[PDB]
Design a protein around this ligand. Sequence first.
Ligand SMILES: O=c1nc2n(C[C@H](O)[C@H](O)[C@H](O)CO)c3cc(O)ccc3cc-2c(=O)[nH]1
Ligand SMILES: [Ca+2]
Ligand SMILES: [Ca+2]
Lengths: 319, 320
Amino acid sequence: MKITVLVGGVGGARFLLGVQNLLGLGSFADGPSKHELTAVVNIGDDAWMHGVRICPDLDTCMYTLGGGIDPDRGWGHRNETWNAKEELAAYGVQPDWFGLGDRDLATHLVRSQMLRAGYPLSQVTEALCKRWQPGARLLPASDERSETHVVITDPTDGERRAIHFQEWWVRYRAKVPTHSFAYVGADQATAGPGVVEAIGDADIVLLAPSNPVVSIGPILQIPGIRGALRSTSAPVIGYSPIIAADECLKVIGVESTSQAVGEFFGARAGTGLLDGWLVHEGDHAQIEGVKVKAVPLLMTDPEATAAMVRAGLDLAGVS
Amino acid sequence: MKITVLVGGVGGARFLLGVQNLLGLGSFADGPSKHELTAVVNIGDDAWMHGVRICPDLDTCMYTLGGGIDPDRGWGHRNETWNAKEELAAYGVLGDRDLATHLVRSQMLRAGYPLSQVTEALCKRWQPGARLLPASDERSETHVVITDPTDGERRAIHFQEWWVRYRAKVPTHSFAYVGADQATAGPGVVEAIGDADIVLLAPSNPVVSIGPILQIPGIRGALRSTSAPVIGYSPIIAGKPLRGMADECLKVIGVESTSQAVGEFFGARAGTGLLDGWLVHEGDHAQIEGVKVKAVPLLMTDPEATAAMVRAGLDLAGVS
Ligand SMILES: O=c1nc2n(C[C@H](O)[C@H](O)[C@H](O)CO)c3cc(O)ccc3cc-2c(=O)[nH]1
Ligand SMILES: [Ca+2]
Ligand SMILES: [Ca+2]
């Protein structure tokens, strides 16, 4: 009936596809729907760039579930052109390191016009989703600003500087000496409309195998959201993103193992979040209070991920 | 060595090229010129659209004098795409290269820069070889008052919406210059009109291209008082197949599409009007009391023919 998933990045979007294929939602609708998919989507990477508002995780989910995503980039449109970006370069304006594709820009333009006219992000997203018809509710973790910053040592002058996550990841490639993460605005952000209720009324809550520190983690920094998870009746099942990201675990000093990431989220039995923790084939993890089972955890295609989604329901004991 | 031109539309940009060709400015420069071209540019078609500020006449002048216009289409960039517009259409609500200009312009305006300075910043890239002064740094947007067919009410529509959607489809009652009364003349505009050796009104549409410049407080007063001669060019070209058609915007204000009527619209400086001279196309006549009228070729076939057109205006004014 009702399943809620926390997501970020391309992995979160690909996980949602697996849920949809499993329950006949969205593009995979084969007859009358009998379940509802709700995604709580990271806003930590959102940024104003060139006077327009970029919501990468919401867009990636919207584009992916709607059949518009670039299969080889994982972000932005299929058949994208970059003529507006080329002309911005010809004007010599900055930032020159962030790619605003022509098709993509229409999304940013409509979004920005609505937000400046007072529409909250949740409403903008549903307005944009009417065109894409993703077959899932894409809820921004908040309608208020909550942006992940990165504290680095700047290589041009050796000075400490905070840069938005986008500049750290897209411009520096996570290649600069990096000291910590800051979730600027998280404590002052309210849980987005429907977010607490979606976590509270779910039959199960799933954590997509997205980046733990900078995709899922920032969702968990919104005060209302972490409490909903601790207080909800539904089982909470996490998927480990460690199959062998590594850069962001290092910054907060956590090992890059399914065991360490499991204890990063922690056990509901204690002060933590998880009731179950699924890890990849051949991987072993043990958390007291957390049901751990090793299963195939590679999102090869919507069919393989659907099995991944099933593995979580089975461990949660939910039908 | 100082010539000021009021301009709007594609005709205004083509006229500026002729001035540049005559005085060796911009693209037609050989060695450093000793003349200065200043354009006073209509802002009446400017609009916020899709959250960005679109300024059509300033951009047309900037792209044209900067050599960025597509020679075989005559409008817009070379190698222009319309993919963002395609997606805007799919969303149910504007060239891709064009959008870059709007993105840069809007960021500057929202950061406190006035339109005059925004224009100077964009011109560093285009280098049009002319000073492009917005008629005002305040909003003054030309609307058209229609009878709306959903409810039969008078409604003001932005001229650009009227032009594609409502023109010739519903009763059209008047023009309104929204914001004009609260607008001041743009920086350097009054001084450009006052210090010129000659002021030219390009053969743009008189009501909605030149006309709205004249609604900006201060600009009409500068025109009446300047010591420079004021020479207007008629936009009426007779001899077309089927005798052409009447200008639709002149029709809204019930003015005939003749060089005589457009001349009387601007009127004579000797009276309450604006012209010292009025050039009409060969084979055409106008007689207005106080106004020197001469028929000469008035087709902007190429910068060379436009250069001759500009030369005739200096000759009519008696300015070297
Ligand atoms: O590495 C890049 N990632 C780009 N991304 C992806 C984005 O960086 C994501 O924030 C991270 O890739 C992690 O999700 C975009 C996402 C959008 O919604 C819109 C535009 C972009 C542009 C880029 C880009 O130019 N380079
Ligand atoms: Ca707040
Ligand atoms: Ca009525």
